[PDB]
Amino acid sequence: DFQETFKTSKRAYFAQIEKYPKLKLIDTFCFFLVLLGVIQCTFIILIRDNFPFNAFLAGFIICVGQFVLLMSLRLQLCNSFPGISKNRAFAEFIVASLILHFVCLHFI
Amino acid sequence: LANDEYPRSWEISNSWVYISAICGVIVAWIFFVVSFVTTSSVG
Amino acid sequence: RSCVLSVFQTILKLVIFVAIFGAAISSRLFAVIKFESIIHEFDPWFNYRATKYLVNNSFYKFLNWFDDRTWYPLGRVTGGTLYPGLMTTSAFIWHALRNWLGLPIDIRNVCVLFAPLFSGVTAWATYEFTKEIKDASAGLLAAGFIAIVPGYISRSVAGSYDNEAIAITLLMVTFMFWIKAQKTGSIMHATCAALFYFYMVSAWGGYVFITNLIPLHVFLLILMGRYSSKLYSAYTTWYAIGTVASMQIPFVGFLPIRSNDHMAALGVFGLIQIVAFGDFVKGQISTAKFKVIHQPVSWPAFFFDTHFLIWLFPAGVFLLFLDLKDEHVFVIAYSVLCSYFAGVMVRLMLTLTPVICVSAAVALSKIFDIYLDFKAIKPAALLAKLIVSGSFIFYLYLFVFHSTWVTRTAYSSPSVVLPLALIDDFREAYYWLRMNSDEDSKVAAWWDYGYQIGGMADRTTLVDNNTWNNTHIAIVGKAMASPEEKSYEILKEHDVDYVLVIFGGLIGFGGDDINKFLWMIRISEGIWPEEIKERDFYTAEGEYRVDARASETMRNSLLYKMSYKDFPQLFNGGQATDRVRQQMITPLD
Amino acid sequence: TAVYFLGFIATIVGFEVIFARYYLGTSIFETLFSSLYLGAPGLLTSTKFLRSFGQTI
Amino acid sequence: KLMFSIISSRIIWATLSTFFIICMISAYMFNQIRNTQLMYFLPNEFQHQFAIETQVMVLIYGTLAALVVVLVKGIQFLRSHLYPETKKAYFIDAILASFCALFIYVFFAALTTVFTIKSPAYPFPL
Amino acid sequence: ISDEQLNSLAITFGIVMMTLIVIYHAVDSTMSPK
Ligand SMILES: CCCCCCCCCCCCCC(=O)O[C@H](COC(=O)CCCCCCCCCC)COP(=O)(O)OCC[N+](C)(C)C
Ligand SMILES: CCCCCCCCCCCCCC(=O)O[C@H](COC(=O)CCCCCCCCCC)COP(=O)(O)OCC[N+](C)(C)C
Ligand SMILES: CCCCCCCCCCCCCC(=O)O[C@H](COC(=O)CCCCCCCCCC)COP(=O)(O)OCC[N+](C)(C)C
Ligand SMILES: CCCCCCCCCCCCCC(=O)O[C@H](COC(=O)CCCCCCCCCC)COP(=O)(O)OCC[N+](C)(C)C
Ligand SMILES: CCCCCCCCCCCCCC(=O)O[C@H](COC(=O)CCCCCCCCCC)COP(=O)(O)OCC[N+](C)(C)C
Ligand SMILES: *[C@@H]1O[C@H](CO)[C@@H](O[C@@H]2O[C@H](CO)[C@@H](O[C@@H]3O[C@H](CO)[C@@H](O)[C@H](O)[C@@H]3O)[C@H](O)[C@H]2NC(C)=O)[C@H](O)[C@H]1NC(C)=O
């Protein structure tokens, strides 16, 4: 069961990546936005200390929220929403990705 | 104490890691956006 | 033809908004042209004391402001104990009228007339919120109700300067911007909904409801199976921008992380993340996807506050419920949840009326869509249409007469002046104390009148209406209950110069300080049990009275001697009536 | 339409420089007024670039 | 088979939800916290009532809600389950709709009469 | 200003705002698809 769904999903995903040269750029950005959050929590687990807690929480929020806006751009960029073009999803990505950096520079 | 008279985030040397985990996402983001409108589709 | 009809619709809507922006303004103003124009109650005299500080020095000296004229041996720090947003939009309107439009007016007149000016924005926002569920013919009707209905006139009359005026508008604008981005799917409307959620989390303390009303919408929207790619983009940007914008306000600093109330939202976000991956696997296989996947209110307050909108409110939810067009679950989920909480509290009737108006202005629009849509000429059909439409237009005019009757009778009266003649003896003795006393001098009264003495007499009290440190009120109530020889020392440790006592035994005030004398004793039993006991203020066989057969330790207390001091020498013959307790006092007592 | 692209990079880099300069020591109203004077021509120019380039995105 | 048609039909959720709003807008909750007695409702006081009076309120509000929903998404079903075979059936719609309007007026007059018995000096009845 | 004139101004604005709604909804119901 899971072998068939596994190899089916690997092949049907890798063909989709090799078709469009926009998708591997998104996913290459995404994976290293996961590794930033992982080692940034590893600093907390390594030495037991919790003192500048807001400065901990700001970078972690940058990693998670910045991951999510990429996944929304990917979902909206493969299949188009009814009424929204592909020139407007990108501008909304710029504006809403540009508010979040300011409110995570005030917070540290 | 006021809200301005506090040791800043430079001077603590416990939160250099997080400032270095903000600057990377900023410059990686601008190199993302410049390298997105100067490329092709299914060339 | 299309230009003619469209121009007719536009001009007629302009005249509608010019009328319904004016009916609200004229309904709020009975207490301003009847009397003078002053701030009304206990709680709105701190806000006016804080927006008069911001307005004549900088904004930097207001965010971190330590005042030493309240809770005197240990003053309070304001910036981490109040909600800014009611003050700073008011200083913004003051700064815009003074410098740009050209006309300078006082800060007191901006503070009095802050609710009636602002209610027209609530009327427009309810128009726009109803334009999404139903076509734009019902939005004018829902906007026509909410500028009249007297469950909402009760909390914003001209003079009230409390937090709910800004709050019940920003609630509506946030729900409008969420209901746009539930249907369309775009990111930018969820960003704007996050920013008005930030501007609503800072003005008002019941922001918890809008935080726990959105994940109940999404969570009921998954169990029916209406999941799409519109929810992954509309929910998660609202949570990502809105949460970290919520943590910027101190007094709610790290509370959306540790606290129980915000847990549901976090859980829903995680749940949404999982189901987005379990939808990609479904597109590949077909077989094994089955293997994987407070006081209770009485009855007539409800008819009293809304006339016949409470009458056809449970018809609009049925007629609304036979459609299920993916944004009706918002209103159906709001209505049950809010109607349960507005039946065990008194003061959650304010969050209930923006759905009595909407759901009471949908069913009536669906009634009007067929009984005055004549388009065939027959006698009997036009008879039926004519008498049904006449039947409802009659009740709607009687709704206007009812609402403006009940505004001017019950909900229009000041607490500062007490009316065949006037009784103004509650502002003599604050202005005495402002004129004829040295400027650093402490007043010790009971905590109900803390805000008015600081606001209107301008001295440095010991307690006020906040009840922040609760073992300080017990010191003051221990002072007003002991004998004289010890209350002198307890009051002298804190450097109190003046003490003051209210008293209503002469004209029957009722809320005097003998009626509130019992609760004081109970607050002083949680700490010093040995010194004071409430088994001693009762007479033989347990009756509370003030007469010539009172207790031996009631007659020697410090709040008895200070109220009935020269009261028997006043009346003729040497006898007196108490006029509230209805008891008789002799000058040996 | 290379000069319009030149007017598209400079407003995003311009919206990062005023955030860094906000982080160092400046107050709010200088950040907000600088964000307005930079804010409007970059809106008009960037909108006309995304309209002009268009179909290959 | 059958339980999936029960959990899938929206009519029982309609009647259950509207029955919940109806039985809770007549101050059922106040009665449950502060227990009272149970001739009729307690006159001239504005904040107290007995226990049988909320039954009368539930009957009233449910009745006129039923009159309104039968007035809007109604009259087609009754004729269909009734006689169609007479003539041009517009007259059944006419007198049927008119009698529904008159029943709305009668029960609304009953409600205003009871509220003037509860709290007098109310300037307009009926 | 005596509040008798404020009373008549209040019901006057209520009736003038509340009558035009019905003719707006009658024009919009009769001469429109929905
Ligand atoms: C898409 C993004 C949209 C962003 C929308 C931003 C809209 C905010 C516009 C605010 C304009 C303020 C203009 C202003 O300076 O008025 C001031 C100060 O007036 C005030 O007190 C209120 C302004 C407080 C600003 C709150 C922080 C910024 C919140 C929005 C980012 C008058 O207050 P005053 O009390 O008279 O003195 C303030 C201090 N001085 C230095 C000026 C002496
Ligand atoms: C160029 C475009 C200009 C548009 C903006 C125009 C602004 C409208 C008026 C602003 C507020 C004025 C209201 C006001 O201050 O009057 C109040 C109370 O008097 C009243 O009766 C209240 C009248 C308010 C009705 C209009 C409210 C509209 C809401 C704000 C626009 C009485 O003031 P007093 O406090 O009594 O001042 C003393 C007056 N003596 C004569 C005793 C000296
Ligand atoms: C999904 C359904 C369940 C939802 C679960 C959500 C609830 C758990 C959320 C994480 C834990 C929250 C509790 C928490 O963080 O408490 C912290 C101190 O507590 C800590 O010890 C820090 C915990 C941080 C987690 C670090 C390990 C995480 C590893 C992830 C890979 C409070 O620290 P404070 O003492 O308040 O810091 C204040 C500092 N001042 C200077 C401001 C005074
Ligand atoms: C019409 C009026 C609208 C009222 C909204 C409510 C306004 C009050 C909320 C403020 C909450 C207190 C925040 C606070 O204490 O800090 C204020 C900083 O003050 C701020 O600007 C708060 C910013 C909060 C984030 C804004 C998110 C919106 C996104 C805008 C693009 C002080 O800023 P400053 O100290 O003046 O700037 C120096 C900061 N350095 C980092 C450079 C040192
Ligand atoms: C707590 C206060 C708030 C409570 C809210 C009260 C309930 C209001 C919202 C639910 C009412 C409508 C439910 C409904 O009609 O949908 C159920 C689909 O429903 C189901 O199959 C299972 C029931 C799940 C909905 C109720 C969940 C209980 C509440 C959990 C907290 C089945 O109808 P459907 O036929 O699926 O809807 C149309 C879709 N078809 C294409 C299939 C025709
Ligand atoms: C009401 O009117 C009086 C009378 O003018 C005003 O009093 C003025 O101000 C102070 C009291 O606030 C008077 O006494 C002075 O006190 C200062 C303390 O710093 C002291 O240094 C002086 O030597 C003097 O004793 C002052 O005589 C008086 N008149 C002036 C300044 O011309 C009062 O301000 C008015 N307003 C109120 C009470 O709100």
Swiss-Prot record, chain A:
Pathway: Protein modification; protein glycosylation. It comes from the Eukaryota. Residues 72-88 are cytoplasmic. Changing C41S: In OST2-1; ts; reduced activity. The chain crosses the membrane at residues 25-45, 51-71, 89-108. The keyword Transmembrane applies. Its main location: endoplasmic reticulum. Subunit of the oligosaccharyl transferase (OST) complex that catalyzes the initial transfer of a defined glycan (Glc(3)Man(9)GlcNAc(2) in eukaryotes) from the lipid carrier dolichol-pyrophosphate to an asparagine residue within an Asn-X-Ser/Thr consensus motif in nascent polypeptide chains, the first step in protein N-glycosylation. N-glycosylation occurs cotranslationally and the complex associates with the Sec61 complex at the channel-forming translocon complex that mediates protein translocation across the endoplasmic reticulum (ER). All subunits are required for a maximal enzyme activity. This is Dolichyl-diphosphooligosaccharide--protein glycosyltransferase subunit OST2. The gene is OST2. The chain holds residues 22 to 129 of 130 of the full protein.
Swiss-Prot record, chain B:
The chain crosses the membrane at residues 17-37. It is found in: Endoplasmic reticulum membrane. Belongs to the DDOST 48 kDa subunit family. The cytoplasmic C-terminal domain contains a functional dilysine-retrieval motif, which is involved in the retrograde Golgi-to-ER transport of the protein. Subunit of the oligosaccharyl transferase (OST) complex that catalyzes the initial transfer of a defined glycan (Glc(3)Man(9)GlcNAc(2) in eukaryotes) from the lipid carrier dolichol-pyrophosphate to an asparagine residue within an Asn-X-Ser/Thr consensus motif in nascent polypeptide chains, the first step in protein N-glycosylation. N-glycosylation occurs cotranslationally and the complex associates with the Sec61 complex at the channel-forming translocon complex that mediates protein translocation across the endoplasmic reticulum (ER). All subunits are required for a maximal enzyme activity. Present with 14900 molecules/cell in log phase SD medium. This is Dolichyl-diphosphooligosaccharide--protein glycosyltransferase subunit WBP1. The lineage of its organism: Eukaryota, Fungi, Dikarya, Ascomycota, Saccharomycotina.
UniProtKB/Swiss-Prot annotation, chain D:
Residues 45-57 are cytoplasmic. It is found in: Endoplasmic reticulum membrane. The chain crosses the membrane at residues 1-20, 24-44. Residues 21-23 are lumenal. It comes from the Eukaryota. Belongs to the SWP1 family. Subunit of the oligosaccharyl transferase (OST) complex that catalyzes the initial transfer of a defined glycan (Glc(3)Man(9)GlcNAc(2) in eukaryotes) from the lipid carrier dolichol-pyrophosphate to an asparagine residue within an Asn-X-Ser/Thr consensus motif in nascent polypeptide chains, the first step in protein N-glycosylation. N-glycosylation occurs cotranslationally and the complex associates with the Sec61 complex at the channel-forming translocon complex that mediates protein translocation across the endoplasmic reticulum (ER). All subunits are required for a maximal enzyme activity. Component of the oligosaccharyltransferase (OST) complex, which appears to exist in two assemblies comprising OST1, OST2, OST4, OST5, STT3, SWP1, WPB1, and either OST3 or OST6. OST assembly occurs through the formation of 3 subcomplexes. Subcomplex 1 contains OST1 and OST5, subcomplex 2 contains STT3, OST3, and OST4, and subcomplex 3 contains OST2, WBP1, and SWP1. Interacts with SEC61 and SSS1. Present with 8450 molecules/cell in log phase SD medium. This is Dolichyl-diphosphooligosaccharide--protein glycosyltransferase subunit SWP1. The chain holds residues 230 to 286 of 286 of the full protein.
Swiss-Prot record, chain F:
Signal peptide: none annotated. GO terms for cellular component: endoplasmic reticulum membrane; mitochondrion; oligosaccharyltransferase complex. Pathway: Protein modification; protein glycosylation. GO terms for molecular function: protein-macromolecule adaptor activity. Residues 1-8 are lumenal. The chain crosses the membrane at residues 9-27. Changing M17L: No effect on interaction between OST3 and STT3. Residues 28-34 are cytoplasmic. Keywords: Endoplasmic reticulum, Membrane, Signal-anchor, Transmembrane, Transmembrane helix. The keyword Endoplasmic reticulum applies. InterPro entries: Oligosaccaryltransferase (IPR018943), Ost4p_sf (IPR036330). Its main location: endoplasmic reticulum. It is found in: Endoplasmic reticulum membrane. It is a single-pass type III membrane protein. GO terms for biological process: protein N-linked glycosylation. Subunit of the oligosaccharyl transferase (OST) complex that catalyzes the initial transfer of a defined glycan (Glc(3)Man(9)GlcNAc(2) in eukaryotes) from the lipid carrier dolichol-pyrophosphate to an asparagine residue within an Asn-X-Ser/Thr consensus motif in nascent polypeptide chains, the first step in protein N-glycosylation. N-glycosylation occurs cotranslationally and the complex associates with the Sec61 complex at the channel-forming translocon complex that mediates protein translocation across the endoplasmic reticulum (ER). All subunits are required for a maximal enzyme activity. Present with 2430 molecules/cell in log phase SD medium. Belongs to the OST4 family. This is Dolichyl-diphosphooligosaccharide--protein glycosyltransferase subunit OST4.
